[PDB]
């Protein structure tokens, strides 16, 4: 395909000249090799799965950790290249067929990272020496306060959950409610607070959470948004 | 080593043998102590298309890649060898294909 | 990056994945027969077929994205 590329650019007049330039390994050869590799898939074989190669520095083949002496193969015909790209990609095969079990699930460091990411607050006796938190109006204010070292990853905070649908719960009745004489009341729960009134309506939920939990939710929401950006 | 060198981070009594260490790209400490050492490290010294790959490719139904890998990447000439050796055992492995249009029994080149 | 969502869209469009991929291979080989421009550099016939088909779906993708 490098020879065919050198013919396509007319930089070699015959296949022997193309082979001679390939032997000379001049930068032109690597530019045409980058042109050839662009959009051409290859099979990797341990266990046999196909990927888009990208020309990389060094000499040892580089593989993605979740897809991880691998052998390498080029599909030669156009029908084979089509079948490879449309059937044989990891995108097409995220499920193990034996029951339909997701293969690529976060594992090793990432999972324990996510575990710590989602460990969040120290609870109760582990958090206060004796028996007896900021509010953030949106999650980017909380992340900003974390970056500015006003709060730590483990530390409890309140986020205004103005998307006041989709509140998570444990089927637990309110741990406490406060009613003001003027008919506002606050419901306090082990995980969140709701301010609502007999006149007017619910003002806001405030969820008691951590920078870690916020980041876990936000980076998935922003991954969905980043993918669906192309839907525009 | 700590008290002789006055390096109190070498033996931190709170978590002996571990120490807090810093990100060279940030200068902030990683918030949990990291185990540190000077261990002794040694530098170490330094295409078959397999049947289970055939089974996997045909499981994907990706059979044109399977055809490529088993034929023109190296009837196929190895099937010619197979038929020739059976023909040398005095067995005629005879390959026919039937015309859907004409029912003609075309003998394959074998 | 994005092109595989188009692939998935077309996989979702066609009623048989294998028949879809057969039709893509057919379209590419008839393209490379009805036109004999070399068309083999930074853009590839498979991506061209996927692009034209997603443009039939109405979506603003250029030839080979």
């Amino acid at each position: 395909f490098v020879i065919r590329g050198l013919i396509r650019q007319h930089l070699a007049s015959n296949i022997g000249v193309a082979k001679s330039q390939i032997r000379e390994k001049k930068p032109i050869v690597w530019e045409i090799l980058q042109e050839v590799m662009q959009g051409h898939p290859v099979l990797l074989n341990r266990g046999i799965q196909s990927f888009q190669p990208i020309l990389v520095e060094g000499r040892t083949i580089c593989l993605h950790p979740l897809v991880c002496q691998m052998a390498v193969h080029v599909p030669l015909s156009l029908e084979a290249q089509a079948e490879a790209r449309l059937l044989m990609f990891s995108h097409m095969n995220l499920l193990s067929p034996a029951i339909g079990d997701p293969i690529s699930v976060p594992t090793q460091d990432m999972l324990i990272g996510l575990y710590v990411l989602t460990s969040g607050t120290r609870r109760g006796i582990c958090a206060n020496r004796y028996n007896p938190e900021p509010f953030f109006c949106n999650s980017y204010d909380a992340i900003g306060a974390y970056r500015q070292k006003r709060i730590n990853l483990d530390s409890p905070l309140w986020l205004r959950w103005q998307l006041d649908q989709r509140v998570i719960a444990s089927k637990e009745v309110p741990i406490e409610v406060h009613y003001e004489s003027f008919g506002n009341y606050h419901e306090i729960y082990a995980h969140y607070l709701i301010v609502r009134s007999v006149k007017k309506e619910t003002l806001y939920i405030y969820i008691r959470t951590t920078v870690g939990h916020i980041s876990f939710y936000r980076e998935i929401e922003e991954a969905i948004q980043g993918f669906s950006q192309a839907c525009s | 080593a700590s008290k002789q060198t006055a390096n109190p981070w070498v033996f931190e009594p709170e978590y002996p043998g571990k120490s807090r260490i810093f990100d060279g790209r940030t200068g902030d400490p990683f918030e949990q102590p990291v185990i540190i050492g000077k261990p002794y490290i040694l530098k170490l010294i330094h295409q078959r298309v397999g049947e289970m790959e055939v089974w996997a490719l045909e499981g994907f139904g990706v059979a044109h890649i399977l055809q490529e890998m088993l034929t023109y990447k190296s009837a196929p000439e190895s099937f010619r060898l197979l038929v020739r050796e059976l023909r040398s055992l005095a067995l005629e492995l005879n390959h026919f294909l039937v015309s859907e249009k004409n029912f003609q029994i075309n003998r394959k080149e074998v | 990056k994005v092109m595989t969502m188009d692939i998935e869209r077309l996989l979702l469009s066609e009623d048989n994945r294998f028949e879809f991929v057969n039709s893509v291979a057919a379209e590419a080989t008839e393209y490379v027969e009805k036109n004999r421009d070399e068309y083999g550099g930074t853009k590839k016939a498979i991506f061209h077929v996927l692009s034209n088909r997603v443009n039939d779906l109405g979506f603003d993708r250029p030839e080979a994205y």
Binding site: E83 | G61, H64 | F18
Partner: peptide
């Protein structure tokens, strides 16, 4: 697979 027919 692809070569169903």
């Amino acid at each position: 697979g692809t070569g169903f027919n």
